[model samples]
Target chain A: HDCNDVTRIDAIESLTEYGSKLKFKPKAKVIEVGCADGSVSNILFQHLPKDIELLLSCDKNEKAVQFAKEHYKNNKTAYRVLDIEGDLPEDLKGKFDNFISLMTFHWVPQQEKAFRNVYDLLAEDGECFLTLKSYSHIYHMFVLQSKSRKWGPFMKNMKNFLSPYYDLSMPDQHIAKILKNVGFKNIDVRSKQKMYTFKNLEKFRGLMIGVNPFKVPENEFENYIDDLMETARTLRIIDEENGTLSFLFNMNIVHCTK
Target chain B: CNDVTRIDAIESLTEYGSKLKFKPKAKVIEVGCADGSVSNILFQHLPKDIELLLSCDKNEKAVQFAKEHYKNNKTAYRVLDIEGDLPEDLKGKFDNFISLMTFHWVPQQEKAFRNVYDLLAEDGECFLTLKSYSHIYHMFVLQSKSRKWGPFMKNMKNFLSPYYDLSMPDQHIAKILKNVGFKNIDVRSKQKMYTFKNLEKFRGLMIGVNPFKVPENEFENYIDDLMETARTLRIIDEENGTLSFLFNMNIVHCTK
Candidate 1:
């Protein structure tokens, strides 16, 4: 799945440190994988010199890749329709000066091998900017709650709060280990805990139902979602009819240079 | 709340303690509030030769009453609520204690429980009890969510505020308690209720209801707004089943 808007915003802000050090050169070569909609890639593209040879935007999603390709074609930025997990187009090998991936590492099954590919893709002394969900993200707190089958002593304990998306994240230690095992150098991964607050539970549940691994499959899952939504409605959190009380969010950005 | 849910289990457990009851070798920690009820029970129900009867509460009035009533004997009362900075004098002093309905009043129940664990003497017995989240979960969760309570919690946590909320899931409490050096921990869930003459009486009972405590600016709006909702709700008491204004209480008993 393409990284959500909030995650994307965080990822771009994270990359600015690396982006600033490079000082937009005309000959700069930057490649963004899983560059959904390319809102960020476009900003970087504009900041870079006009004579830049190539600022390729790539994504596994066909439609999204096409959209990126269409937007940057006239600007001499080549777009690739290659899936990050699949074959690397011959044109892309060793062509990237700075290989970047944002909020895309957790989805692929072979995370270590993928990082190795990223390592090999870079030019001499070239660096990479990557960001992914740290496993310890507060999302696990919500996961532990939902899967609670036998209610413990604290079940009715009012302190039990759940995050709609925690189970989907990867832990911090795992990220570090996998990247290190992949032979990344100067690996720096930092995590920031965020809490999302929504005024009402229904809107929060709506967001959960709209996306996540918890997505209902139109059968048993549908009833679960329906039950969940009803519960949220019962919480009556969305009294204002707009945003409700929920966490802001917590994220991590990991950058490693070859 | 059913008698079986709240009192029966507790009565049975407290009875077991009376059999082994001695003036505990060290000081006592009373959980919940060390109020008239607990003091009466301790005096009449248990072996009374204790070195000290240390009753604790966040309510200054309750502490004051406890101190006045238990004056001559080895009785000392503390007005230390779990949420306030733990009383500076309590470090490693208490030996055995019983905590009742009070843990629920704390915003960060884990820290307070941990503090309890730290304050107890080795092999000390502490009875920690509270009405489960089931009882007041809906009432408070909604109220807090209506007003973003995180900022409030953040500010409180920054000051090391001692308020407690024992409303965490069981495993969470168990895990933290384990980490805090609590052994032989036993958790049980009991649901019970209290009945009032009428809805007006029920509203009066909210005086001690903590979920409504918020920033001063929002306090009036909350009180005035919640009254209408409270008044409309049907109030009924069942002889063999749920009470009209019932509480689903959970009582935890653990030994250090």
Candidate 2:
């Protein structure tokens, strides 16, 4: 099944530490928001603590959810379609003991409402651990494409896809304060950067397509990829040598108890 | 540009009106009423005894424009999605469900059809139409994969309607209609030929219904690509500086 590659990488980056870093209770009911074809959920399923409970995963995209239901079936995982910014499903209210989301919050334009939904979805004494892409090479490339003649019209709504705090110097503290307002205590939010390298041009291009938040035509796909990578290089978001590409990925790791 | 297609839609519905069980005082819902032009023009053609025809579009902007420009005593405009859960106000309210040149945009046909069924009252009827196998769909995919149009069309597959490769679309749609519990179902592909007076008119229809964002300067190039495909498909005929083209339109009529 086709999944969003970017979020899977996000899970993979922090996989080894997940078992120890996140707290889990026996038979806990957990919800993973923005599963995006369940790649991140798959990563979490294999690495997270053996909580001895079901992990309910969901995404806003019905297409992705269908793909996940068809391709990634597990006895412990259930998939559904959910929009974090919209009206939360009444049946799902306070049903989860824990919540986990990776590289998803940034795509949410209504951040406050999304955070409020997260708070509402958590049970008393439940906790949430999440990560948001504060900034990345893809962000710069999207901006660059938004201004170009060939891609501008197709990406008229490009700003909607961009992380709201991508340009900020300290998005973590801001997010932490938001969680505090939502009555989440014992807050621990911090920004981290990973120097990841794409083995070759094809890998870099794959990453670009996997994370593309806008509708790009199949026409001239290679040219589009080439231009995006070129723009990433121009914006200093990535460094390339002999077809290999490198970028410093910025993310905000968030943890708090409701 | 789309006005020409509106004629085809109106004609198709008029043909369906007497064949189906329709009440003169029936409450109607026109799904995918983009800009409400068809709905506005349709008021004169439908039963004058109709109680009300609420024309709804998924796009907020489209509904706003519809309200501003096409508002009428017989028709009301609102933003509604056919794929989402049944709306509170509209749930089980309609006696007649009508959609024109729109159903194909929905990827989840079952969900959309179920919503349509849910919107209808007991013993309610529906008349729907969509692009079955249009030359435009092929042209768009071909152009999207081409070197020049690929940049503009990379997400072209996303915009295309679902399950297009089926050998028998009528049977396929009939199955979906039956699965949604539509009774006395009628589903078939209507081969419709429309004659555009000139090249510009044909081109206008393409650009008018085009879901993609095409630059103003590249209009000629874009039209040429579509026209080239139309010529290859042998559906375009020119005589005395005029062009005639045909398409496969899937029409559905059923009772809930």
Q: Which candidate is the best by DockQ?
A: 1
lDDT value for candidate 2? 0.72
| Candidate 1: true contacts recovered, fraction | 0.04
Q: Which ten contiguous residues of candidate 1 chain B have the minimum total lDDT?
A: B159-168
Per-residue error at B115 for model 1, in Å? 26
Which segments of model 2 are wrong by more than 4 Å?
A1-258, B34-36, B213-220, B234-239
Q: Which ten contiguous residues of candidate 2 chain A have the minimum total lDDT?
A: A233-242
Residues A54-133, candidate 2, lDDT per residue (tens digit)? 88888888987788788888788888989899999899999888898877788888888898999999989888888787
Backbone clash tally (model 1) = 59
Error of 1 at B147 (Å): 14
Worst 10 residues of 1 chain A by lDDT: A158-167
lDDT of 1 at A138: 30
Give lDDT tens digits, candidate 1, residues A1-258.
555545645555555545664443347687877665756566565456676676777777778777766664546566667666565666667777777777666556656667777877776666677665432213332333344343222234322233211222224445667678877777765444323344555545656555435433455555565554443344343345565543323344567766
